[PDB]
Structures are given as structure tokens and as C-alpha cells.
Amino acid sequence: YLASLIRSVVALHNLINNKIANRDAEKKEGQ
Amino acid sequence: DLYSRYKKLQQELEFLEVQEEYIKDEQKNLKKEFLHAQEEVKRIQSIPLVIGQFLEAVDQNTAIVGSTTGSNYYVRILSTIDRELLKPNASVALHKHSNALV
Amino acid sequence: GLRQYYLSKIEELQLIVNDKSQNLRRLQAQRNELNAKVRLLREELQLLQEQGSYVGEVVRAMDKKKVLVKVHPEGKFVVDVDKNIDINDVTPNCRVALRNDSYTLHKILPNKVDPLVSLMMVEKVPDSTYEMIGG
Amino acid sequence: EGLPKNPDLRIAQLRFLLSLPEHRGDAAVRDELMAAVRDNNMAPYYEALCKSLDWQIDVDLLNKMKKANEDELKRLDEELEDAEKNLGESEIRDAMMAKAEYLCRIGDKEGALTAFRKTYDKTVALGHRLDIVFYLLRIGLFYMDNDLITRNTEKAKSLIEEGGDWDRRNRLKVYQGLYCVAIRDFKQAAELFLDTVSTFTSYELMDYKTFVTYTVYVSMIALERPDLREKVIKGAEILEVLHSLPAVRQYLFSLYECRYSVFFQSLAVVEQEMKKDWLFAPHYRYYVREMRIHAYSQLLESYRSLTLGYMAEAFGVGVEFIDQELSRFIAAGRLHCKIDKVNEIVETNRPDSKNWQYQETIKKGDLLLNRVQKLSRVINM
Amino acid sequence: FDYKEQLPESAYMHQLLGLNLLFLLSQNRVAEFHTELERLPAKDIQTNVYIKHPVSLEQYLMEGSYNKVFLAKGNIPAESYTFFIDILLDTIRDEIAGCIEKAYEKILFTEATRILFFNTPKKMTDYAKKRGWVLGPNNYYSFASQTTIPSTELAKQVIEYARQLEMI
Amino acid sequence: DDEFEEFPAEDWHVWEDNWDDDNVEDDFSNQLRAELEKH
Amino acid sequence: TAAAAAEHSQRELDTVTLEDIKEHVKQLEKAVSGKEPRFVLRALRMLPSTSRRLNHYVLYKAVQGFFTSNNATRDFLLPFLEEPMDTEADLQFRPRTGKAASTPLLPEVEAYLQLLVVIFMMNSKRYKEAQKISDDLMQKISTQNRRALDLVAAKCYYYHARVYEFLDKLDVVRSFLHARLRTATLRHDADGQATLLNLLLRNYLHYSLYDQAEKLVSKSVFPEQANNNEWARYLYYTGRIKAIQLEYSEARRTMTNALRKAPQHTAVGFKQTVHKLLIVVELLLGEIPDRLQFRQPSLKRSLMPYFLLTQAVRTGNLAKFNQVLDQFGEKFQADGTYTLIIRLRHNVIKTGVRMISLSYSRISLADIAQKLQLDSPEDAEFIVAKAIRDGVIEASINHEKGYVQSKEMIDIYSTREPQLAFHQRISFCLDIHNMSVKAMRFPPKSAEERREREQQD
Amino acid sequence: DKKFHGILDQGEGVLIIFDEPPVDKTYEAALETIQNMSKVVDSLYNKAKKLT
Amino acid sequence: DKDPILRRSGMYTVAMAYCGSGNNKAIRRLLHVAVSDVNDDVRRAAVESLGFILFRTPEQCPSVVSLLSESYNPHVRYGAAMALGICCAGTGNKEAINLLEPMTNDPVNYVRQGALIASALIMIQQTEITCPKVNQFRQLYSKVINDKHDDVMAKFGAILAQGILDAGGHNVTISLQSRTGHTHMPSVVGV
16 A cells, blocks of 8 residues: 555656656647 | 548547557557667676766766876766666776766 | 438537547657657667767967867877867866767766866865954 | 844744733733833834734823834935945945844834845955844744745845854854754754754843753653753753753653653653743644653654553543543544554554555655646646 | 425424334334434524434334333323334344343343333233243243354455465 | 636635633633632 | 706716716727637626716716617616606717718627626616516527627626626526526536526525535536636535535535635625634534634624634534524524535534543543433443443543443554655645646747857957 | 562562563564655655645 | 477468458468567568558558567568558559658668568559659669678668569559459469
């Protein structure tokens, strides 16, 4: 359970980073 | 025109069946070949290579290394190398001929 | 009635093709990323056998796109700059990579430690402030 | 000596007292607070306090304080401009730091904060940066700004790490222990207070008597018997200050050596003063409950069974009251026994610590899983 | 319920609705009971005796207040409620007997009569023969008849964990 | 996005949030005083 | 010149809102041209702000020019919309003079503008011409049939249902709304289907036809591809239905999901209602709400009655419970909870029994009755026996001596319960990881070097 | 004072002595890790909601 | 069958049997073999077989051939190039030409050869206005031929490409189906 929770938090961090990169790229393209 | 939308029916079948499983097995075999490619690029770590010191990192895939022969070179670094081990002044293994951080 | 029949099934199929197209574009993106990664590795094995590039410090920039460079640890050459670096950016006392055969300045590496910085690091005068001073 | 009492925490104490319903009208408290207000020309703070407490604004006094504050601010801005033009960076910093100091001394939270941020931007001395950070931390204690407190605590830790000022490190220990007491983190409060008991110098916050009182309270509620024995019951400084203090020494030693029902009169008096105190006020009920649970556990640990009659005799309380209290705590799950009521007798048991750890793991994992799921919904959509 | 307005309502409405609630309770359709009960207006549920007796009877049944459930037999705000209440009493006798089965490591007879709300030892003996008891060899109905790792289910769960981890 | 106007609205502590401080009870000082007085 | 200054401020706001609606309608026609509907969702995201700024007959100033090819609309819109615009106003700002190519206005844009008219009537608080014009819009959209039109149709459906809500007669819409739900289910439009189902469930709840709503939920399938707000409303309605039908676990999960999916910056009324009912449902299952809800400023005075209810139930004595009932019934009728709260009476019985069993090994039946604050000890007897049967308690009753002796509380960690708890948690964590990995969106994405390498070699 | 794990039965007048099991370090580390990862999740709030 | 040559024979047999039919089962089999089978020659043969099967609808091939051309295996890329050439032979498909243009100047001699040959097959009997890439590809062919950088197989591809472009005195087109819509068996066999 501890490892699964840690993995879930890491996956959420990866998703946050991916969405941040996506918005940055889209905004730069729109610029 | 509406039986042309039946043409669109067969178009839908074409997208659905032909391409989905195609990409599925394509990415499966691409994972297989990725493992094979990593094991192949291991080839550059051949035993007879010269030792050096990792001075500075320029890019994610390039760095300056002082070879033990006396000179120092700005050269690419193997991707399959733990960058946490590239501490300052850390001893590294440079390719004998290409002189890259292997 | 049959016109409505057709248009109904046609719209059903339009929805099916639309969602399947989103799905297939996602799958194609995944596949392209993986294939690019693998191709990058396989070309990496090939392009790591290239000669490593020397590192030399520019001492003076000539005309006609040539730069006087001291290559570590022996040798002072004049190298033609590559056609990707504005010669105006090779100001003296800066590290630059030189291609192995036929030395050719092809990159401006991060600047060497300033001689003054090195001298002050050797001298090691402890940093001070008025609040450390008292009396 | 300690850092300046610019955001005087005694003013916050008096405001909290006047906020309490049994002191909303205390003549002495009101008069002392007004003495401080008129002595420091707290015009903005006086206006805000009158608004909050529904008092009548003494327009004449407010106007005179406002004129005094405006004159001071104008004069000190003139000094700042003179330092800008003629004098150097150190003089500029001194002038604008004085402006921040006066904006605190007139209880102007936002202006003082902005002035301190500008001063910290324009300051070059690590010690002076720590002084500014401690000013901000004291403002945070005054206004119970938890975000400000945590941010400035991290800032102070970072600044101390370089420089290694142990005096500043001990001062930060005292400040962080005060914050931990405020937020009901008694374990860390006791840890910090015991670390800094022999090096306390922060008189800007509170006297050594009150510091040792708080240290003894948090140590009793947090530490186990061996640690309490080694630290509080034998620390030379704690023992001397407890010799000075007639009451808290009796409270601590009664708890330690099992003199019961005197522990309860002590707990009642300390509860009253805890309720009076602004720092311990929204934790006095919790502290009393925890101390009662600790006393019951201490009495019950060394006996397989113990009659409710014996419990009541030891604690001086009645059998029915001790029975109801004990049953309440057992239902809460903070006592390791059961009580047989047909023939009153309390029988203890020894549940393995694995059960407690599993319950705590489930609870904390549920909190963190709820947080993770909330984050997931926030991001995915 | 349908034709609100255009109708002046019937005084018998609340009585008959309470009778319907009694019927639902007797047949033990609690969900439908509560659903229809929600139809009754607030003050009708709270004050009107005809709607209070059914809801109160369900409250007592859920709590286990079988004494007050039995006293409902005397309460009976409308005599027509007897029919739907007798069957509920018999079902409640069964439920009480189940409570007795699970609890009461040992129980006697003279008091078990009042516990089961019976009034005749012949009825007691017939009911004991129903299901089955020990008859009280010492006048005590001693119905005190109170490992195996779920390895298969646990292995299925662990394999599910593995599959959910490896389909990445 | 949506203000959720379908429904009406009625005009309108970093420590662990526990449901035990809520008990309605006189101060422990008062409780102990009463117990001692009746003792 | 306060009047003139206010008029000028109003006129500049009119220009701003006019250009805003220009941009919105532009989005609409470019959406229908490009075949991508969600552009209409982007346009419709600002219905609240547009409605808030939709006053002073700015929509008159607009429609008088827009609605040039659909003169059949003026006959109704203008008489209800008056002619309050100043004589000249020196503006003359229109869609190229309200004239592009004599083309009929796109049905989506016409529906959008007429929805603006309907919501302006909503704000004006005159719900008769609003009803008539809403019926006219319904006829228009029923005649029309377009995919990009489904979103505006959904918004129109919701606002028309709101008009009839204010009319106080929703049973009249019942038939038309339900038939149009059937139409939107036959034609696969998830947004329309979801909104229609939500409005039908709201009507059923308003008339207290929980059994009807139960069948509707059972035999209707909600579209999984619905927005967070329709999901929140549907989950709330389903949770209330389950709570009344005595499916408390389903009530808890659906209602918690509704709270989580509701917007967190607005919808204070929805949050208050969901928190109240969820507090009731938790308290009914036995789980007790956390103090965070009652500490929340948004909803604190609203939950005080429920706060005292929670205190009473958790304390576990029917005295405090029934006094609390007595004081705070009125709010419980303003909301509607009698059945749930008296099921909570039973649950306070259960909680008192649980506390007594946990804290006591042996205790007389009279003491149990006293601590449960019950009637005669025989009732406490039967309650305790029923609890032991149900499994609330594991104890055994000694009637001869008239007490209750509890079990030894078999060490749980040596059983499978920790495995089950950790299994639920592990499954959910793995689900979170899988959902995140699936959600990660990957955005779409030299030979001179090749030749140079070949030549240098 | 925890100098030995036992309990004093006054009634009979005996001294029961328990071979108290050691405290599991795995659960201690798991709880501390849960706390630290809660700090991590707070930092993730700070990054996401402020940026996202 | 065990033999890779027998497997390639199976791929070609599928191609011939289902030529023009666009049978989804044949497409599935050929594409799965091109993906997962362990021999590069048969992978290339499978891609070419898919090209054969899809010529009645030249608009469909571009997608799959693009996915297989911006791809992993040099043989798979080459097979995609020939699939495009076979599919669009005589059509001058702008999409196919755009797909093949990057393929030229690929890091593989035979891949460049196949891309050039397929490009010429597509622009068979074409002109500038019909498709604005004929001059680009003609000058590319000429430079490749009169260069020494390029590999011998790239030179072979360029010569064959010029021959195809100017095939039949530039008075002939390659169509796998007759002008009346009947599959042209001589053309299928020839290709």
C-alpha cells in the first residue's frame, strides 16, 4: 500500500509536468 | 449520397479494425526493439578503453572530459549512463577511438 | 422515413469514426514517440564512434572568419569558425569546441572560470560585512 | 537581552483577553492596553481594535495619534530621501528599516510587511536579513498568520544554515516552539523548548518564568516518563525556575510521583490559566483531556485490575464521575482497559502496538489518499 | 395524490394511507414503505396519528423495541389495523426468537415465555418444536451451539494487483 | 463555470481536526470543584 | 450630472457586452462551419457573466439588427422586450448594419440569442411571456436537428425548466421534457441526454416522486461523457434517491463524488445541500462527519443544526437526540429529512450500544438503559439482544443475573481485516496511477549533418 | 519507568512478566513516509493549482 | 511456414489474391506481418503487398504508408516507399509525393533507391502544373546521378527513376487497372 501510494503521487507529478509542458507549448505556438 | 455514407461505413471499419490493432502490435514490437537497441548500444563499452575525468557538462548529452593522455575534449556521453554518477572530477571511461564518455 | 433512417445510422457512424479518430491519433502519438526514441538510440550507437572534439581557449579573433585558439594543453592554431556561430560571439578568453580533424570552431562552451575569480579563490579572503565588524 | 518588542505580543495578549467573554469589559486590561496604545501612538491598530470590539472611537485621541503618525512618517520619508540622494546604501537601508519598524510600532500590518520586503530586498547583511525575518515572524505570531509563520520559518532556517549563528538558531527554536504550541504540536513544542531551555534569551516574546511554565506543560503532555525524568525532573535550570515557581513545580512533581487529586487541583488551576492565555487558549480543553488520560493510564499501567473505588479514592473524585470519565476515554480508545460495572472494577489489558500503528497508518493514509484524489480531480479536469 | 386541486381531500385519506403503510410493514417492503412515507407532508408525518403510528412502529421495529411493537396491538388508532398487525406480530415473534438464538448463551422457560410474549406453555412447547430447542433439561434452553485462510480469494486479489501493475 | 442557481443559498486551524473537543461540558475546574464539594 | 455619468458608464458596458456577444456568435458560426461542436461549449462557458451583464435591453440593441432574416421572431420578442433604448444614442453599431447576405440566421445562433432573451426575462421576473417564448424556442429546436445545436438545446432545456420552476408547475413540462429526453437518447447527444435526465430527476424530487425517479435511474443509463456539473447534479439526485431507498453505501459514494465534482469557486447552495444530506447519510451509516465541514465559512451557519445533530448522535443518548430534533425540526422541514433523522434516532441507539460495549466488559441491563437514556429496562434488553444478533455487538446476555458480558475483542491485526482495508486502498491507488498515465496528453510533434559526417569520414 | 515489562496483580499479590514484542520499525518508517509524502502532495498543490 | 522465403511468398500471394479488393482481412494480415515478423525481407514484402492491395482507393494508402515510412526498420521504410509507388502509379498523388519527398535523402542506400523509384513511378507521365514537384524530383535525380557522394544503390535508384519518368517516350502511364476499371493482370504481374 505504501509503495502504491508513492507510485500514485509520482504519477500525479508526471501528469502535472506533462500538462504544464502542454500548456506552455500551446501558448508559445499561439504567440 | 446516403449509400455514399455507406462508403463512410466501410471507411469507419477501415479506421477501426485495420489501424487500431496495427498500432497496438507496432508499439509492442517497438518496445521489443527498444530493449534490443539498448542492448546493442551496450556494444560501445568494449574492454580496451581509456580512463578520463568528467570535468563539466555542457548539454544533457555532451560534456567536457579530460582524458588521461593529457588533453581534454568536448564529446558526447552515452545515454544509458546514470547522470547521478557524473560527479565533479569523477573518473569516467572514454572510448579508445571516438573518445566519448562511455 | 428511410431518409431519416439513413441519416440516423450515418450520424451514428460519424460519431464512431470521430471517437475512433481521437483514439487512433493518441495511439499514433505514442507509437511515434517510441519509434523516435528507438531510432535515436540506434543512431546514437553510430554517432558515438565519431572523434571527440578538442576544447581550446580563444585568445584573439582574426578577420575572414578565423580565430586564434590555444588548444589544451599544447598548440596554438588559427581555426576557421563554423557557419553556425557569429564570429562576434567568440570574444577572447572563452572556451570553444574544435572539430577533431581540420579544427573548426563549432560550439562556444561555457566560459572558463574568470582569472580574477580563480585568483580570489586561491587568496581566500574571508567575506566580511559591517555587521560582522564591531567596535 | 532580546530583540526589540516592536510588535509587542503583550498587546496581542491583552486584545485576546478583551475578546474573551469574561474579560470583555475588564477595566484593568482595557486601561493597560490603552496605556500601550497612547504610548506607542497605535492609531491604525486603535481604529481596527475599536471596530472589532465595538468600542466607541475616541475621536480626539485617534486624531492626535493620526497626526503624530503622519508627522513621523513624513519626517522619516524625508530622511529616507536624504539617504537616497546624499548618503549610501547602508544609510538608505537604516532609514527604510526604521520606516518598517515604525509601521509595526503603529500596528500597520500590510504597510509594515511591504516595507520589510523592500528592506530585505535592499539589505546585504545576513544578520540584518535574519533580523527582518524575525520581525516578520513576530508579526505572524501577533496576527496568527500561519502562512506567514511557515514561510518565514523556512526563510529563517535557510538563512541560519549559512552563517551558523547559534544565537539566532536558538531564537528560531523558541519562535518555532511558540508556533507549535499555537498550532497544538506539543511534541515538537516540548522538543524545541527542552533544546532551548538553557539558552533562552528571547524576552521579546515572554519572560523566562512563562517560558519554563510552557516548557513544563508541553513536556508533561508530550514526553514519556523516562524522558520527563531525565529532562524536566532533573534539569538544573528547570529545577531552579520551578523552585521560583510554587505552583507548576507542584503540578509537575505530583504528576511524576503519583500524588493524585493534587494533580487534579493543579490541572484545574493550570487549565484556568491556559484558558486565560492567548497562546494556549484554543487548546486548553484538549490539553486537560490529554493530561487526564495520561494520569489514568499511568495509574492503570502497573496493575492488572484496579477497583473504580480505588481509582476514585486516589483521584479524590467520586466513583460515578471517575467511572463516566474512564468509560468515555475507553470508548475514545485512549486507555487500554475495560470496566466491569456490575461489581465495579477496572481490568487492564495489553494490546500490541501493531494494532495502534495499523490504525494510525489507516488514518494517515486515508487523509493523504483523500488529498491525492482531490489533486487528481483538480488536474485531470 | 394525483389530482391535487379540483378535489377537496377526504378525511379518510390519512387513515387509509397509514393503513397502506401498515400493509407495507407487514409484508416487509421497507424501501417502498419509506418511499411512500416520504409522500406524506411533513406535519402529517409528525402530528397526524394515522401516519405517526405506522412510522413509530417501524422505528420501534428497527430499534428492537418489541415491547412497544406489541403494545401497538393495544394502541391500534383504527380498529381496521388489526389484520395487517397480526402477521407483523408473528414475524416479530420469529425475529425475537432469532435474537434469542444468537444471544442468551442460556435461557430459562418461565421468563422466556414473557420474552417471546407468549401466554401458554403449550404454545411455548409448540414453538420450540418449531426450529428446534433442547426443551430445558434443567429448565434452561441451552442453544449455545456457538482458520481456513481464504487463500484462493487472496491469490486472486494479488494476481489482480500484478495485472493492474503490468498492463502499464 | 455554472453558478448552480438551481438550488438556493443561505446568506453567509492547521492542526488535526478531531471530533472530541466538541463535547458540551463545564470546565474541568468546575467539574472537579463540584465533585470535591459533594465529596 | 450623476444621471448622465451613470448613463455613460452603462453605455460603455453596453458596448463591451455587445462586442462580447459578437465574439460568442462568431464562435458559434465558425464552430458549425468547422464541424467541431465543442467550440459552442467554449462560447457557452460564459452564460453566467453574459446573463449578469444582460440588462438595460442591450440585447434589444443587438437583436433589432441581428434578427433581420427571421422577422417571424420580432412579433414576439420586441413586444415583450419594449423599446426603452434612447432615441438616438449615437451608436449605430450592428452586424454590418444587421445585414451580411440575407442568409437566414443559423439555428444555433438564433437559439443562443433567444436564450439570452429568455434569461433576461428570467431576471426581469415576468414569467408569462418568458414561458411563451420558451415554448416557441422549443418548437424551433424540435423542428431543427443539428449536432452543434445540441449544446445550446441543452442550455435552453435547462432554462425553460427553470422558467417553469418559477411558474411553480413542473408537471406541465414533465411530458415534453421526458419525450425530448427520449429523442436525445435515440439521437446520441450525451450533453442533451444528461441535462434532460438531470432536469427530470430534479422535477421528480421536487414533487417527491422518489419511486418514479428510482425507476428512471434504474432503467436509464447516464452518459459517461458529461461535464462535471451535470455529473455533480446527477450524482446528488441519485444519492438522495438511494438514501431514501435505504442504500446508504451507494448514497455515500455518489454524494461524495458529487461534492468532489461540483465547482469549488461557486455553487454555494449546492454545496450546502450536498453537505447537509451527506452528513445525514454518514451519520446514518454510523460514520461521523469531520469538523472541517462545520468549520468551513461558506457553510457554517447552515450546518449548525446538523452540527448539533452530529454531536447528539455521536454522544449516543436519545435525550440529547430528541431535544435537538425538537429545536431544529423547522430547518429539517425546510430541507426535508424526517425519515433520515429518525433512522438516525435508531442509529443513536446503535452508537450508544457500541460505546457501552467498547467501554464495558460487564454491565447491568439497568445501567445499559440508563446510559442509552432508554425507557424501561426490558426495551434495553431487546435492543441489546437485537444488536448482538445483527452483529453490532459480539456480547452475550446473562438474563438470570441480568447483565451483558462482552467478548475479548479478538486481535484484528491477526485477521483479514487489515488485508481488506489495504486492498481497497491499493486498488484505488493503482487506479489513480493508471488514470494519470492514461490522461497524460502527448502534443503532436539532419541530412546536411549526414553528408558532412560521410565527407569527414 | 519501563525498566521491565510486567504488571503487578495486587489482588492475588503476584507479578506477571510479559515478553513484550519489539516495536515494528517498518510501520514507523511507513508513517513517517506518509507524512513526508503529504508534504510532497502539499507542494504539488502549490505547483499545480497556482500554475494549472 | 518456417522458411522466410516461404513467408514472403505468402505475403506476395495475399497481395496478388486480394489486389485492388482492399480486403480488411488481407490488410490486417499483411500489416501485422510487416510489424511483428522476424525477417526484414518479409517485412518489406508485406508492406509492398499492402501497397498492392490498396490501389483502388489511392487516398487510403497515404496514412498507413506514412506511419510505416516515418518509421523504424530500413526495410519497412523501403517497403512503404514501394507500396506508395505501386498504389499511386499513374495518379500523381500529391500526398504520396509529399510523403516520399522526406524519404529521399534517408540514411540508407536502398531506402533512397526505393523512394526515388516510387516517386518516379508516381510522377509517371506527369507535368509541373498537375503536380508541382516534378521539376524538384527531376533535378534531384540529375544531381544524385552526377554526384559522387551518393551510394551506388542510390545511383541505381536515380537512373531507374529517370527511366520511369520518361518511360515510353513519355507517352505511357502505369495503371494497375484498365481505363474501364478492370484490374490489368499484365500490369500487376509487371509491377
